[PDB]
Structure formats: structure tokens, C-alpha cells
Design an enzyme around this catalytic site. Structure first.
Site, mmCIF file in Angstrom:
data_model
loop_
_atom_site.group_PDB
_atom_site.id
_atom_site.type_symbol
_atom_site.label_atom_id
_atom_site.label_comp_id
_atom_site.label_asym_id
_atom_site.label_seq_id
_atom_site.Cartn_x
_atom_site.Cartn_y
_atom_site.Cartn_z
ATOM 1 N N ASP A 84 0.832 -1.200 0.000
ATOM 2 C CA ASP A 84 0.000 0.000 0.000
ATOM 3 C C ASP A 84 0.871 1.257 0.000
ATOM 4 O O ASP A 84 1.017 1.952 1.016
ATOM 5 C CB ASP A 84 -0.973 -0.009 1.185
ATOM 6 C CG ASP A 84 -2.024 1.065 1.075
ATOM 7 O OD1 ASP A 84 -2.163 1.667 -0.018
ATOM 8 O OD2 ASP A 84 -2.690 1.345 2.080
ATOM 9 N N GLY A 175 -8.991 9.969 6.771
ATOM 10 C CA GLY A 175 -8.418 11.258 6.364
ATOM 11 C C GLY A 175 -6.935 11.365 6.639
ATOM 12 O O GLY A 175 -6.262 12.255 6.106
ATOM 13 N N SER A 177 -4.930 8.615 6.074
ATOM 14 C CA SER A 177 -4.303 7.686 5.123
ATOM 15 C C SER A 177 -3.301 8.370 4.240
ATOM 16 O O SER A 177 -3.553 9.478 3.757
ATOM 17 C CB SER A 177 -5.327 7.059 4.192
ATOM 18 O OG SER A 177 -5.901 5.919 4.793
#
Ligand SMILES: [Ca+2]
Lengths: 223, 11
Positions: A84, A175, A177
């Protein structure tokens, strides 16, 4: 950020906001032209906002720069959230100064117990929704492999780590991330996921940046 | 459930 504190204007000068007509994710400036964020934050039309404190007011020191490249890791798995990580290239180089500065990449991985600074404009509540105007900060330790896997069995890959507080009350949240986990001046983590925010026995999970330093360098060098 | 911390992904 739940259970954190107001950072103070420009005290986290590598912190950026990703904006698409609203703040939707954070990121970390790693040189004048490149930002590290989360793969799951990918979308078209990203504007990178540097030097921000109050994201809703033009205060001075802001630089708004369009993303010219948004490079999701080719092995990003949207189901497991493995790999990620995303690199954003800015359309033009940011002007670097005391209020807009890069953060160093790790030379080695960090160990369990190491204090880190996690920051962002995410939700400040563990139940319900409140979004801050100014940047919030939280100091949080890296957890051991064993507590991270116990918390999230079958879900933690070698490219993830846990940080935070098993007693609940302190965490990153929606928010945040894509934003930084910085430990002794090195970007060790990217805010990725978790079960809710600040829940007991459910710490935050972060992309393990030390595994990607070579990929980051190779990708930047070829772009 | 597990969710990413973006605005506004859960599994
Ligand atoms: Ca502002």
C-alpha cells in the site's frame, strides 16, 4: 488523528495534504519533486498542498502543485492492502524552506518500542466524525510482530506493521491515510488501515516503508 | 471491520 494534539503551524514540514476539491489523504515530501502516500489514496486530479496548517484558510506558506505522475506500486493488492504505497511526482519542484521540507527515507527498519510521530487532518473521533482545520499530531510506539499479528490474524504481511495503543483512545483515522509515521527522523510508515480508529486491541496498521526504499529510489530515478 | 483511513474502503 484521535487522542492527539495540535502540532503547531508548519512543525511537520514534510506533511502534505492531497486535495481533489477537498482533503482526502495525506502524504510525505521526500524530495523537492516527490511525495510518498498510500496506494489506496490513488485517483486522477490530485493537487498536492504543501506548507499547510489550517487546510480551510489561506494563511501564507502554502504551495499548491498538481500531481504530474501518480505511481501505485505494481503489486498493490486492493483486497489485502499489501504493498500500500504510491509515489506522486509534482508538476514542478516545491520551494524548500523551513516550513516545507523533505523527510529522510530509512536506512534500516525500526524496532518495536521505537516512538514515532504520526500526523494528519483525519477524523479526531473514535465514534462519529469531526474533521480538524489544523494539523494534528500523535506520538505512538511501534508494536511487536507477535502483538500485531495477534490483533489482526492472517492479515499482517511483511510489508505492514502496527503502531499505537492497545488500551484504545489514540490512533490515526479516516483522512490520515497516506500520511507519515516518522521515527527518529526517518519515514518508517504510511498510514494505511485498521479496524475502526482508537479501538481497544485494534492498533493502526502502517505500510512498512523500509521494505520499499530500493523500489522508491529505482522508480524515482527512472521517472 | 478493517477499513482504509482515507476520505470518504472497508472489508
Ligand atoms: Ca491553509
Amino acid at each position: 488523528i484521535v487522542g492527539g494534539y495540535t502540532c503547531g503551524a508548519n512543525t511537520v514540514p514534510y506533511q502534505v495534504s492531497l486535495n481533489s476539491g477537498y482533503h482526502f489523504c495525506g502524504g510525505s515530501l521526500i524530495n523537492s519533486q516527490w511525495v510518498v502516500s498510500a496506494a489506496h489514496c490513488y485517483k486522477s486530479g490530485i493537487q498536492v498542498r504543501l506548507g499547510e496548517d489550517n487546510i480551510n484558510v489561506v494563511e501564507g506558506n502554502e504551495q499548491f502543485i498538481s500531481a504530474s505522475k501518480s505511481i501505485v506500486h505494481p503489486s498493490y493488492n486492493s483486497n489485502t492492502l499489501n504493498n500500500d504505497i504510491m509515489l506522486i511526482k509534482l508538476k514542478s519542484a516545491a520551494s524548500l524552506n523551513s516550513r516545507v521540507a523533505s523527510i529522510s527515507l530509512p536506512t534500516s527498519c525500526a524496532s518495536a518500542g521505537t516512538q514515532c510521530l504520526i500526523s494528519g487532518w483525519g477524523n479526531t473521533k473514535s465514534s462519529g466524525t469531526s474533521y480538524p482545520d489544523v494539523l494534528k499530531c500523535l506520538k505512538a510506539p511501534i508494536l511487536s510482530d507477535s502483538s500485531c499479528k495477534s490483533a489482526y490474524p492472517g492479515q499482517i504481511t511483511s510489508n505492514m506493521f502496527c503502531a499505537g495503543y492497545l488500551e484504545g483512545g489514540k490512533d490515526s483515522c479516516q483522512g490520515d491515510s497516506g500520511g507519515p509515521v516518522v521515527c527518529s527522523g526517518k519515514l518508517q510508515g504510511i498510514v494505511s488501515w485498521g479496524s475502526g480508529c482508537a479501538q481497544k486491541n485494534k492498533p493502526g496498521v502502517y505500510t512498512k516503508v523500509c521494505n520499499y526504499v530500493s523500489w522508491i529510489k529505482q522508480t524515482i530515478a527512472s521517472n | 471491520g478493517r477499513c482504509t483511513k482515507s476520505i470518504x474502503i472497508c472489508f
